[PDB]
Structure 1
Amino acid sequence: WTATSGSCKGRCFELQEVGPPDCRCDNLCKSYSSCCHDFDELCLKTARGWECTKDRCGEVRNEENACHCSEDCLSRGDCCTNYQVVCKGESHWVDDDCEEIKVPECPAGFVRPPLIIFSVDGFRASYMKKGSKVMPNIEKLRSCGTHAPYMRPVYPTKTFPNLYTLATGLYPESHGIVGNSMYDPVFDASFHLRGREKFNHRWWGGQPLWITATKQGVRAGTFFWSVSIPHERRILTILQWLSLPDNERPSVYAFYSEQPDFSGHKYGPFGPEMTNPLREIDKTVGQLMDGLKQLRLHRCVNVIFVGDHGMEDVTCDRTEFLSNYLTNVDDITLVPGTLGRIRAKSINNSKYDPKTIIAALTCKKPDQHFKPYMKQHLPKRLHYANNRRIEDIHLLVDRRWHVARKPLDVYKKCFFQGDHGFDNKVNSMQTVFVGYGPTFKYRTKVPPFENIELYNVMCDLLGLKPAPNNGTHGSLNHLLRTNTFRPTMPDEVSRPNYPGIMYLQSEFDLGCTCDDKVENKLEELNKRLHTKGSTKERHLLYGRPAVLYRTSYDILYHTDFESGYSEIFLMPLWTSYTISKQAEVSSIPEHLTNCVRPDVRVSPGFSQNCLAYKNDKQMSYGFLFPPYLSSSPEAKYDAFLVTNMVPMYPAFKRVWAYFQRVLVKKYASERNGVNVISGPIFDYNYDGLRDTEDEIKQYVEGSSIPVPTHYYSIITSCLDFTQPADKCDGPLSVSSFILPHRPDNDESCNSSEDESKWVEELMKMHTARVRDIEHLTGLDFYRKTSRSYSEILTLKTYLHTYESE
């Protein structure tokens, strides 16, 4: 109940919201059916429109007008945004030359440059080039300020998950807004686009920017606008707030546009109808910038122009129906569209079986346009599993397609020509970032980055300490002229042991054998040097990774590779090796096919054993440093050490062997040498973070050898590929992957073919940032380079996406 009989007189767009049943006058009151009786009359004036004309100049203030052109309007803070242009011979902001803003030029009483965040729904990255002709204000922000060619959204590339990631720096699995539609089984409650449930605070986790600011004594404009408040009024309200006295004036403001998303759904991303919405958004930017110029704030405020996600061509005829795969289609609930999420329709139905639903959805039709996954098997780069609101069964839908349960759903709910929500690597889903102002750099292009990084920067711009988030603070320092955040590298927690030869061969009873009994002062010196680290500078190019948790591990040196060997997990945490452009691939000699060799530096008790692998009928083993890339027949024996072995499903060894035998050499050819760091990952609770031993759900049968959920590789070379990876003077280039360690290759529909037709495609799907691997392993890489730490943080956030131009 609202007592709507109060009044908005002098309260129009008031900043502190009043609690029921008192009536509201804030920018959200409409959305709650709670505005005072006179809110439209007082607060949403429209008389005479939004622009001054010659004949209104110096008019007698008529308080009924939407905005004013009278002499007192500047001191009142309510001129039409074009007042000075029409009446005082001023130029529009867009017509002025770009002039560097070296320092904030702010009115007296401004404690800090205000931040204005102008967010545009469905603004596809390539609009910046393709619509450039019709967006002069936006093109001026872009060219004069700091811009990226695109900004990567989070998955799913839906509105609320992305807007809330922008607000919090968190992945959707952490902030809780995991879709535009959700069921939370703990609350037994549903979140929907339409309706009241979405307003309840229990959905919204983390700490969004407006709350961070308020806790730290920075005042925030109310960020949200009821849909029916026109854009012109939103802008005028912002400009009026900026004229408040110092102690009342917010320091951060948000404007949100429903366009171009609204038209893009109806017309497709490049429909001829899309020109007009782009022109209109540009005009709104123009109004804001002119308004700021009138207030003498255009060289004071930092402006961020940012999108939530892009827009792809999607029509009703490109829908897959679960009713064409499943017999029991009525026993499931599907969240449908550009992603699928499946759960049982009834929790009382004990013949619901996810195993058989996944199987019935797997590689069933030659050109199938979605792939099913248990959520824990989704590419780790999506960070889309650790929330009870995300259903165990997920469908990754191909770009340009939808999934629905039954055909009747698509016509008893073609209308639409555009949609979004697909994998956040997809080109059409990318969106925009421009920063303009004293704190941003001048005429600077920066590489693409992820939207999870922006909260930290918005906090930097306001001098706030960010709440704990998923950005990597400092990785976007290169966007900023000042207010950079200068982190220190994390402290190493565990120091390595450096074992020498401590065990005789006969102390080992591992059930391993090797044909290695063949018997030189010239080369005995050499092998000793190699075991003491003489080639370490060749194979460990960026320092040893730091271990950021408490554990017991050994560094092991070899001719061709160096490793950090965990006495707790019985295998390396990491294995580092460099392969030059000139390296040759060799085979595993016949007599060495089953060879595994005790490592006399490492106790029997801290070693794997071959008997466990023999007894475990499901599990085999692979090597981290590949025997195919040994530098010589004698060095090859090192690759068969028990300490270089890791457990592998035969199905996965198909993937791994092709990566090691074919792909590493290919990359070293193309990149002029590569340095490779590979290792296991254990993430049995799918939280994206290194498991402790007590979280491991599977061991090699009859042993304490833990089975990895994933295997990673980090592949580094020189950005200037005229320099070899091991003699690089400047910036680095990296690609990485986190491959799921699966007992079948059901994910790859073409896996009965030769590895050359499917393995590299799989690896590309599981591309990763170094930072993702850091979370998953508790390691910190690139500790010793010649590069600045901020540059290294940017490198660690890099994602190689394999999308075309």
Structure 2
Amino acid sequence: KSWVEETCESIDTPECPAEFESPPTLLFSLDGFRAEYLHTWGGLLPVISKLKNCGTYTKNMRPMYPTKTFPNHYSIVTGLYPESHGIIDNKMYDPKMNASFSLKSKEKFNPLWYKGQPIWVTANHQEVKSGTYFWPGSDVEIDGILPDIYKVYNGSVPFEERILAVLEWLQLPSHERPHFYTLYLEEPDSSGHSHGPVSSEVIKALQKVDRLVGMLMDGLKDLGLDKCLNLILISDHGMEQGSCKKYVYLNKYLGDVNNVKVVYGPAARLRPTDVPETYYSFNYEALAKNLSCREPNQHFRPYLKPFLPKRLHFAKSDRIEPLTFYLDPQWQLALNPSERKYCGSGFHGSDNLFSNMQALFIGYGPAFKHGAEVDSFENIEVYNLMCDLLGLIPAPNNGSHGSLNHLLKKPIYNPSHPKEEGFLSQCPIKSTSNDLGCTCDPEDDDIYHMTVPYGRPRILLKQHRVCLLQQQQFLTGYSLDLLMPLWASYTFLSNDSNCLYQDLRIPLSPVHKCSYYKSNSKLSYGFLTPPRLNHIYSEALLTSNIVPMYQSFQVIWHYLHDTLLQRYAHERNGINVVSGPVFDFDYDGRYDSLEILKQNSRVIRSQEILIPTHFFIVLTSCKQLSETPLECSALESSAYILPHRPDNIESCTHGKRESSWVEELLTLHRARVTDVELITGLSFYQDRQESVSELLRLKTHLPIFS
């Protein structure tokens, strides 16, 4: 009886043949295996379905941005964001090197492209042999290291021969046998491109790929290793149906110009022709402004590289062009109709939160639970997972180590909460009392737990000076070094102008006075905690609850609290809110040091002001609608990092439909709670009852669009 014909068998303890001390780990990749394939065509894929039912499976695996083969395949084995491991796209360019990159190029085998540290390099440093077959980065030697058994990419090699090749390696002597293995197939990406996600060729391809995995499992069984191997069946990205009618050509707004180069696709980037002479000299800002809101319902959007949604993490690399393009689903962009390969073929590269860009993940073996279905997770988390399976100390990566502990029978690493590095001090009443020049028209522990019911946010900043200011409706963490609130937490239940009051607990700043703010300048002040809380709550008008805010952003911020927040409190039976300013001028995704902070403090209206690049907001509710935010059994988080812009060009306010464009901006800039943590240097939910591993799972979550 073949492996697919046998029923499920619990592999609680690894049953290994002699010469084996611990089960090896194979990473099997199927390029272009969209997550929707297995959801719908499970009955046509008997082998893969058994792996799903007897292993650890996830409905959707979120890939990196852009959704291309090389960046993702390399992000899997490095656990790094594409902006950090160097491989931004299949075709890209580095200005500092004056060299282009391609899969079919001599530049591909250049070690100067590949940053970070892949798993086979990690295994090599810790005396673990590794045998790869066609994995991106396996052909090239990184840090002077090559896998003990490798094969230079040759797409002509038949699939059946690839499986047998790995099977031959598994039989090597105990001293010369690799412990980590890789496998790569071009299907169903190839069939996906040429005929579309919904075709007879993909069904024929899926069945071909399904039987091929079945060949491997029967082969493992004949070697007596079917219950002694850890298999991770993964993919790089999904597949979306492109259309000729749904394609964007830049020439229509610019003309048949030759001063600019466009890397076509759903994640288009633009660089000047005179390169690297004008790579930086070229002002991209003008081109972006000249390209925004040209169509009534534009299916693309010009983005300066730091102005992209932070959830994408697609800015801090030399190879990423300073001008990028975000497109609606099923749409691609190019300069001229001649550059593109074809328009009505299956494509990929769209937003990694899109439904059809989602990838596959099935963990099977003695180390994985049987028939366990877990929530969605990013592919950068897999790197740490493999380190635990190979007993390796992971290189510094972007994955939350331990967040995938729920997948394993016996978890190897037990994570802990980050220690508080902030110098926490106290602010009593010391400075009374300046005149603010404002016109106004006519025990403690019990009130604490109501505002921070999951525990106060911990200050991960080193070594920032932070004060805790307690109020009757909210608790706010105030910064003494920046003289503005870092965060403000309050609980908003289901149903419950030019004036300000000086907070005598904080030192007076010239920007606290209403006299500082004129009605002509676009810069004004906003509240972290809404004043319309619970007559009117007056402590929200405290000086320590205001932050410098553009007037254009006030359009989004007020509607966020006056309309959406109240609606969300009814739908989710109340919400706990933590809000604050974001300062990331070097657009690296992490909080800025005091040094770079002093460099970006502009001066406006005769006063020095550090103005926020973004504003974060984390909404927490109960998973059980019967419970209020003060009595949650399980949490329900959703974070947002809203861009602080002087204008709403991104939104195309033109047409004046305010209730529409705002929510679309909110949904677009949703982010992981971890993302907020990384960018503010704060740690949430530390006093929450769930374990650390559970909390990591919660904080790294993002919803899939459509």
Q: Same-fold call, TM > 0.5?
A: yes
Deviations 1:389-412 (A, max 9, x none): 1111001122212211123334xx
Partner of 1:547: 459
Partner of 2:143: none
SS state at 2:168 partner:
helix
Partner of 1:202: 112
Deviations 1:367-424 (A, max 9, x none): 32211100100000000000011111001122212211123334xx657520000110
Partner of 1:389: 319
Deviation of the 1:631 alpha carbon: 2.0
Change (3 A) 1:606 1:292: farther
Query: Is the contact made by 2:77 and 2:383 (CA closer than 8 Å) also made in structure 1?
Result: yes
Deviation of the 1:206 alpha carbon: 0.5
Deviation of the 1:476 alpha carbon: 0.7
Pairing 1:780–2:693 present: no
**2:400 aligned residue (472, 492, 495):** 472
Deviations 1:628-680 (A, max 9, x none): 2x2253xx110111100001110000000111111111111111111000001
2:557 corresponds to which letter in structure 1? W
Partner of 1:258: 186
Partner of 2:587: 686
Query: Is the contact made by 1:570 and 1:705 (CA closer than 8 Å) also made in structure 2?
Result: no
Alpha-carbon distance in structure 1 between the residues aligned to 2:406 and 2:223: 30
Pairing 1:142–2:52 present: yes
Query: Is the contact made by 2:241 and 2:344 (CA closer than 8 Å) also made in structure 1?
Result: no
SS state at 1:408 partner:
coil
Alpha-carbon distance in structure 2 between the residues aligned to 1:424 and 1:148: 16
Partner of 1:641: 542
Deviations 1:332-358 (A, max 9, x none): 111112221111111456994322211
Query: Is the contact made by 2:525 and 2:547 (CA closer than 8 Å) also made in structure 1?
Result: yes
Alpha-carbon distance in structure 1 between the residues aligned to 2:198 and 2:601: 50
**1:307 aligned residue (235, 245, 248):** 235
Query: Is the contact made by 2:23 and 2:230 (CA closer than 8 Å) also made in structure 1?
Result: yes
Partner of 1:326: 254
Pairing 1:792–2:698 present: no
Deviations 1:121-172 (A, max 9, x none): 0000011122212211110000111100010011000110110101100000
Change (3 A) 1:512 1:477: farther
Alpha-carbon distance in structure 1 between the residues aligned to 2:286 and 2:486: 36
**2:42 aligned residue (114, 132, 142):** 132
Alpha-carbon distance in structure 2 between the residues aligned to 1:337 and 1:786: 45
Partner of 2:502: 598
Alpha-carbon distance in structure 1 between the residues aligned to 2:320 and 2:123: 30
Deviation of the 1:514 alpha carbon: 4.6
1:581 corresponds to which letter in structure 2? S
Change (3 A) 1:223 1:211: farther
**2:493 aligned residue (557, 577, 580):** 580
Pairing 1:498–2:498 present: no
2:258 corresponds to which letter in structure 1? D
2:609 corresponds to which letter in structure 1? I
Deviation of the 1:240 alpha carbon: 1.1
Q: Which residues of 2 match residues 398-413 of structure 1 at below 5 A? A: 398-410=328-340
2:492 corresponds to which letter in structure 1? I
Alpha-carbon distance in structure 1 between the residues aligned to 2:322 and 2:199: 37
**1:434 aligned residue (354, 359, 362):** 362
Change (3 A) 1:786 1:483: closer
Deviation of the 1:226 alpha carbon: 2.2
Alpha-carbon distance in structure 2 between the residues aligned to 1:312 and 1:281: 19
Change (3 A) 1:246 1:632: farther
Alpha-carbon distance in structure 2 between the residues aligned to 1:789 and 1:483: 13
TM-score, length-normalised on structure 1? 0.82
- What do you get for the CA RMSD once the two structures are aligned? 1.8
1:788 corresponds to which letter in structure 2? S
Alpha-carbon distance in structure 1 between the residues aligned to 2:388 and 2:282: 50
Query: Is the contact made by 1:607 and 1:642 (CA closer than 8 Å) also made in structure 2?
Result: no
Query: Is the contact made by 1:326 and 1:357 (CA closer than 8 Å) also made in structure 2?
Result: no
Partner of 2:554: 653
1:399 corresponds to which letter in structure 2? P
Partner of 1:369: 299
Change (3 A) 1:301 1:380: same
2:80 corresponds to which letter in structure 1? L
TM-score, length-normalised on structure 2? 0.94
SS state at 2:476 partner:
strand
Pairing 1:621–2:525 present: yes
**2:668 aligned residue (757, 765, 790):** 765
Query: Is the contact made by 1:750 and 1:757 (CA closer than 8 Å) also made in structure 2?
Result: no
1:212 corresponds to which letter in structure 2? T
2:660 corresponds to which letter in structure 1? K
Q: Which residues of 2 match residues 456-467 of structure 1 at below 5 A? A: 456-467=384-395
Higher gyration radius (CA): 1
Pairing 1:570–2:483 present: yes
Pairing 1:244–2:148 present: no
Query: Is the contact made by 1:616 and 1:700 (CA closer than 8 Å) also made in structure 2?
Result: no
Change (3 A) 1:202 1:287: same
Partner of 2:142: none
**1:707 aligned residue (599, 604, 611):** 611
**1:379 aligned residue (309, 325, 348):** 309
2:338 corresponds to which letter in structure 1? L
SS state at 2:607 partner:
coil
Deviation of the 1:612 alpha carbon: 3.7
1:712 corresponds to which letter in structure 2? F
Partner of 1:47: none
Query: Is the contact made by 1:569 and 1:705 (CA closer than 8 Å) also made in structure 2?
Result: no
Query: Is the contact made by 2:438 and 2:513 (CA closer than 8 Å) also made in structure 1?
Result: no
Could you list the runs of 5+ residues in structure 1 that have no partner in the other structure? 1-90, 519-528, 584-592
Alpha-carbon distance in structure 2 between the residues aligned to 1:484 and 1:408: 53
Alpha-carbon distance in structure 2 between the residues aligned to 1:320 and 1:264: 22
Alpha-carbon distance in structure 1 between the residues aligned to 2:553 and 2:287: 23
Deviation of the 1:616 alpha carbon: 8.2
Query: Is the contact made by 2:438 and 2:498 (CA closer than 8 Å) also made in structure 1?
Result: yes
Percent of paired sites with the same residue? 46
Alpha-carbon distance in structure 1 between the residues aligned to 2:71 and 2:677: 24
Alpha-carbon distance in structure 2 between the residues aligned to 1:439 and 1:783: 29
Change (3 A) 1:351 1:292: closer
